[PDB]
Amino acid sequence: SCVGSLVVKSGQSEDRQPVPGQQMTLKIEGDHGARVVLVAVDKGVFVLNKKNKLTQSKIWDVVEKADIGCTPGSGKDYAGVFSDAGLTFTSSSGQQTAQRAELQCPQ
Amino acid sequence: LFIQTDKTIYTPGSTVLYRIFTVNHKLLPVGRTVMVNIENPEGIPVKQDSLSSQNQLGVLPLSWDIPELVNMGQWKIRAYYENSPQQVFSTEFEVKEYVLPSFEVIV
Amino acid sequence: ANNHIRTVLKLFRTIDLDDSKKSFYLTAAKYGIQTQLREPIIRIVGGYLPSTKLSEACVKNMISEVYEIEGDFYSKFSYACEDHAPYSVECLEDARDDYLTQLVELFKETKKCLRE
Amino acid sequence: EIRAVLYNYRQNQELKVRVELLHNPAFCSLATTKRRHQQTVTIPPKSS
Amino acid sequence: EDIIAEENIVSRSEFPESWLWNVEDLKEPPKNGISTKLMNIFLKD
DSSP states (O other): OOSSOOOEEESSOSOSOOOTTOEEEEEEOOOTTOEEEEEEEOSHHHHHOOOSOOOHHHHHHHHHHTOSOOSSSOOSSHHHHHHHHTOOOOOSSSOOOOOOOOSSOOO | OEEEESOSEEOTTOEEEEEEEOBOTTSOBOOOEEEEEEEOTTOOEEEEEEEEOTTTTTEEEEEEEOOSSOOOEEEEEEEEESSOTTOOEEEEEEEOOOOOOSSOOOO | OOHHHHHHHHHHHSOOOOTTSOHHHHHHHHHHHIIIIIHHHHHHHTTSOTTSOOOHHHHHHHHHHHHHHHHHHHHIIIIIOTTSOTTOHHHHHHHHHHHHHHHHHHHHHHTTSSOO | OOOOOOOBOOSSOOBOOEEEEOOOSSSOSSOOSSSOEEEEOOBOTTBO | OOSOOTTTOOOOOOOOSEEEEEEEEOOSOOBTTBOOEEEEEEOOO
16 A cells, blocks of 8 residues: 555535536545646546556556565575575675676576 | 556547656655657657656656547557666557447446 | 426526627536526426515526626636637636636525525 | 424425324314314425 | 527537546645645536
């Protein structure tokens, strides 16, 4: 779920269904200082083509797929564990992780 | 960059309005210049433009008026930051001959 | 409950916006007034038992107010929107919001006269 | 004193009720087997 | 009769596929860290 919290609902509590040419009040509950951008779109266009819609799940999927890690936990040893996490650990004595020279994780 | 287009299907001779959010790796607004180009299915860029997100809170509203004599199919919008042109973000909108359906069918 | 309806229809037929003005502006203004002052008060007036008496005084007040409202909308559409080109369709779009807002405020205020 | 409370819940329709207290041999009131007690009232919409 | 005249009826004309292309800022004072803005939109036809 998103870092902040945005939700849109109607100022009129229940009333009756709206009518073409009748005004309506939208209540927006967002964090202070934020800037919202609005778009109102018919549902026929979504009947015809419902692909490439924007939603929070897509954003989180895109953020997650660009991670540095490679395995959800543990490894062969400390060097493997750190590299799997996505870090480097170099000590004066010499214990340092294996070098990485490729952006995408293997297989 | 998270391209948002208001609709998902446009008739020829109609105007497309889209937005280009600009965020950094922590999902915060950032001021950097972007490049956007709109390419028909033959992969031939049509409109080239450059913007800056400075003093805009990372929201760049834009527009384009689809030419009357165009090819149908999946058009694409490609946007990328100026510094790193290797990473390209895209979103597809479809140009088609349609009239809005009156009802939805679910299977 | 129909004689009152025919009366108020006779009142809104006496409205007059001059022809010399542009066609889309005329349709915009007339559609605003029709959807904001002719549907709701026709709905209200349709629900009076016939013995009840109307009050055309506030209806003619309604019409005088809608004349000045339309005049202000036209003045804002032709002169005020200096941010855009004059006589522009999107200038009309910008001014239509507050035109209908003022108009609904007028209807809300004048809903308390239809009964004697 | 007995009160009859008439409700009308039409959104915009004024109503014309004709209430009536039927005669009862037990009590005593204006109702009689010869003459009937009728009030013809008017109920504004969404009003009691 | 009990019919609306032809000239009096005015037709719905705006049928936009997508409208309300607006950007707004939440500058109202915050309560419980959650601001609330009421905005007025006139529905299309």
